Amino acid sequence: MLSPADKTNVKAAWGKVGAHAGEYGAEAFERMFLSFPTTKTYFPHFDLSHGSAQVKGQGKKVADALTNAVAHVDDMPNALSALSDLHAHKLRVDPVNFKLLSHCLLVTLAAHLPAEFTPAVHASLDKFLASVSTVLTSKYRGVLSPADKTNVKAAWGKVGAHAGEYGAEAFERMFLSFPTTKTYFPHFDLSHGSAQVKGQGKKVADALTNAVAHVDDMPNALSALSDLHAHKLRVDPVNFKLLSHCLLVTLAAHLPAEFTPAVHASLDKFLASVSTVLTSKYR
Amino acid sequence: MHLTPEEKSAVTALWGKVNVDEVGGEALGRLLVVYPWTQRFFESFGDLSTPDAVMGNPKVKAHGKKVLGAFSDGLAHLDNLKGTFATLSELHCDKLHVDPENFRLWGNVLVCVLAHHFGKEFTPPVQAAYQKVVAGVANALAHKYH
Amino acid sequence: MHLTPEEKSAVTALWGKVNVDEVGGEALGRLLVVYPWTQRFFESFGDLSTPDAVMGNPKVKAHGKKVLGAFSDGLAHLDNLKGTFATLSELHCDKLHVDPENFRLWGNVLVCVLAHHFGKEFTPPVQAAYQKVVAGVANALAHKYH
Ligand code: HEM
Numbered sequence: 299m300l301s302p303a304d305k306t307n308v309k310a311a312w313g314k315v316g317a318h319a320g321e322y323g324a325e326a327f328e329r330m331f332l333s334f335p336t337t338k339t340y341f342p343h344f345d346l347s348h349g350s351a352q353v354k355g356q357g358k359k360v361a362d363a364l365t366n367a368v369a370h371v372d373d374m375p376n377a378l379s380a381l382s383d384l385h386a387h388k389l390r391v392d393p394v395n396f397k398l399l400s401h402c403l404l405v406t407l408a409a410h411l412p413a414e415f416t417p418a419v420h421a422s423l424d425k426f427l428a429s430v431s432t433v434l435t436s437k438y439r440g441v442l443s444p445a446d447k448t449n450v451k452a453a454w455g456k457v458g459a460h461a462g463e464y465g466a467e468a469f470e471r472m473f474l475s476f477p478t479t480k481t482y483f484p485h486f487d488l489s490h491g492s493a494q495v496k497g498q499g500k501k502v503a504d505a506l507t508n509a510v511a512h513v514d515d516m517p518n519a520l521s522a523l524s525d526l527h528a529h530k531l532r533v534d535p536v537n538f539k540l541l542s543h544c545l546l547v548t549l550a551a552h553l554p555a556e557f558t559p560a561v562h563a564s565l566d567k568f569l570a571s572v573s574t575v576l577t578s579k580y581r
Numbered sequence: 582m583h584l585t586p587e588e589k590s591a592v593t594a595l596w597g598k599v600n601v602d603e604v605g606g607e608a609l610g611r612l613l614v615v616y617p618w619t620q621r622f623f624e625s626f627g628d629l630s631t632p633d634a635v636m637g638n639p640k641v642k643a644h645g646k647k648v649l650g651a652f653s654d655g656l657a658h659l660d661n662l663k664g665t666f667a668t669l670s671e672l673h674c675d676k677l678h679v680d681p682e683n684f685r686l687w688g689n690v691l692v693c694v695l696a697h698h699f700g701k702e703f704t705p706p707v708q709a710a711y712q713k714v715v716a717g718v719a720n721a722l723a724h725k726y727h
Numbered sequence: 728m729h730l731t732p733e734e735k736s737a738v739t740a741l742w743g744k745v746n747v748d749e750v751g752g753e754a755l756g757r758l759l760v761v762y763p764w765t766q767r768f769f770e771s772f773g774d775l776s777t778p779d780a781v782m783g784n785p786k787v788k789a790h791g792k793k794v795l796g797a798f799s800d801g802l803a804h805l806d807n808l809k810g811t812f813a814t815l816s817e818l819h820c821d822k823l824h825v826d827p828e829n830f831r832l833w834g835n836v837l838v839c840v841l842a843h844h845f846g847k848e849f850t851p852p853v854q855a856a857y858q859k860v861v862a863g864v865a866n867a868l869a870h871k872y873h
């Protein structure tokens with residue numbers, strides 16, 4: 299979330315960018331294609347050689363769009379509306395790639411703005427490009443529809459008194475599948491059957507039950523949990539995706555009749571929204 | 582790919598029960614439903630507008646079976662996934678232009694489908710071994726990308 | 728880790744111009760500023776209240792230099808990063824409990840720091856070579872996690 303001082307820092311740097319934004323945009327794509335060659339799969343129709351008119355034009359278009367976003371930083375979803383539609387329905391770039399371009403744009407700005415690229419401005423620019431990325435990927439699936447909310451309530455209703463037991467199973471599945479997540483629990487017994495893991499699973503399932511109950515008001519209902527994870531526990535955001543998968547696996551294994559493709563899709567969306575809320579105060 | 586005896590045993594035992602036709606189409610269909618941007622590679626497959634259209638789309642079912650068929654063969658050569666998938670790796674990069682991140686999403690959907698189909702028999706240690714394998718296969722398919 | 732001779736030379740040439748102490752301190756400070764959740768390991772380092780407090784903290788600077796000194800010595804072992812970093816991998820997992828995701832964040836912040844330090848000299852091909860090296864170093868530090 300862009301603080302007012304964040305907005306000040308971005309406007310500062312981007313002004314300095316000034317008339318070179320298009321050149322810088324092209325350089326960032328060229329850096330991306332070279333450092334992260336999987337990104338070239340989205341441009342097989344381009345001459346991707348150095349200095350190519352197609353790559354230059356791409357950079358200027360992308361630069362103009364970021365200029366638009368800087369100039370409308372307090373209403374980005376609306377300023378970028380057309381662009382969110384096009385990437386969501388037509389281009390369909392996998393979201394992970396936005397992080398790769400954002401890193402190469404940061405690198406480009408660093409290499410060109412020696413005086414301005416201070417630690418605080420770097421932090422602000424990083425947050426700004428993550429917000430842009432978030433807005434551009436926001437319609438790929440589009441936040442919770444009334445059908446999504448119905449599906450979630452129906453499935454979570456069937457979980458019911460088993461909520462805690464499925465939360466403990468989800469953690470155990472996560473620890474065995476993705477051993478790096480164990481680094482957050484060095485003080486627990488992680489063996490199968492562990493009461494500490496059972497207790498953790500219960501707390502998490504209980505919070506989720508609270509989220510389904512307040513599905514139209516999740517940021518307030520989880521505000522204290524958002525604070526806890528961001529300033530105390532400080533779990534790296536990538537791990538929320540790993541637990542969400544393991545929760546989905548757990549539900550599938552216990553709910554053979556209810557876990558339809560449509561319900562699977564709505565649950566994945568719901569857990570991603572929960573994850574978003576829990577990491578929203580990190581920076 | 583190195584698996585422990587315990588892990589390789591779990592993988593092979595469960596795989597003998599898998600109907601490659603049914604599971605394969607299920608996994609590709611759910612990928613297209615849950616992550617709809619993956620539909621960008623299948624424009625010529627017909628109607629994929631609703632979960633029901635997707636799941637019952639026969640071209641989806643046919644392609645799904647083919648994909649899982651090639652995965653199945655890879656289970657035979659767990660010691661050399663790279664060499665086994667080299668030609669398909671080059672294919673997916675040079676001709677099909679598929680972002681390797683899709684292989685990871687497909688792997689995770691497959692694990693979801695296995696849990697759904699097998700229930701309590703798909704235990705935590707069994708999932709863990711399958712997660713290793715799908716990660717191995719995805720890295721193998723991404724190996725020849727340039 | 729496999730780099731071409733060209734890339735190796737590109738990495739080595741630039742590194743000869745680096746002041747390990749200054750760059751090391753700057754990269755750790757920027758990591759703690761830009762991704763503040765990474766501060767979770769350094770509550771004994773004292774004042775981390777603001778970007779300026781972070782960047783001028785002597786304990787931050789000292790740890791930064793230590794980290795980059797180990798990085799630096801790894802650059803002389805690009806063909807055996809895993810064996811070179813094996814014991815440090817076990818240390819960060821069993822005793823320090825550091826999520827390997829932090830190593831990737833650290834690697835990206837170091838690349839920004841080099842670009843800031845060296846400007847136009849930090850060309851796209853030179854960047855590409857460092858991106859492989861910090862990825863390779865991160866994988867090697869994560870190798871012994873269990
Ligand atoms: C900050 C992130 C991004 C912004 C602001 C952005 C913006 C744009 C804009 C303004 C256009 C042109 C729209 C038009 O002319 O109708 C475009 C096109 C495109 N973008 Fe994005 N983009 C971003 C990230 C990405 C990423 C990460 C990729 C892929 C790795 C990507 C791939 C494409 C493709 C394939 C095109 C079409 C090029 C053509 O064939 O003309 N974009 N983008």
Ligand code: HEM
Pocket residue numbers: 479482483498501502505506523526527531533537538541572573576
């Ligand atoms: C759906 C995602 C999550 C939710 C809703 C959630 C919720 C919670 C809840 C309810 C607590 C207990 C707070 C209290 O003591 O009152 C908690 C604590 C904790 N969470 Fe999260 N959590 C989530 C994801 C994660 C992830 C992915 C990790 C790390 C892999 C994690 C690690 C922790 C840790 C380390 C604790 C404290 C354990 C203890 O000392 O008792 N959380 N979480």
Ligand code: HEM
Pocket residue numbers: 619622623644647648649651652669672673677679683684687718719722
């Ligand atoms: C473990 C995962 C996968 C394996 C082993 C696999 C295997 C294959 C095989 C054996 C073919 C046939 C090539 C030929 O007929 O010459 C193929 C084609 C194809 N694959 Fe992959 N695939 C996998 C994942 C994916 C994913 C995730 C996508 C995209 C979301 C994808 C998209 C395609 C496309 C578009 C074709 C061509 C179909 C056509 O002819 O219309 N593949 N794949």
Ligand code: HEM
Pocket residue numbers: 765768793794795797798815818819823825829830833864865868
């Ligand atoms: C490529 C990156 C890194 C390398 C090469 C590296 C290397 C080292 C070295 C050489 C030590 C000293 C071990 C000893 O006492 O013998 C160390 C300790 C430590 N590192 Fe890492 N490290 C890296 C990244 C990180 C990151 C990103 C974090 C956490 C955000 C971290 C946290 C720590 C901590 C907390 C210690 C212990 C310091 C103390 O006890 O005073 N390391 N690291």
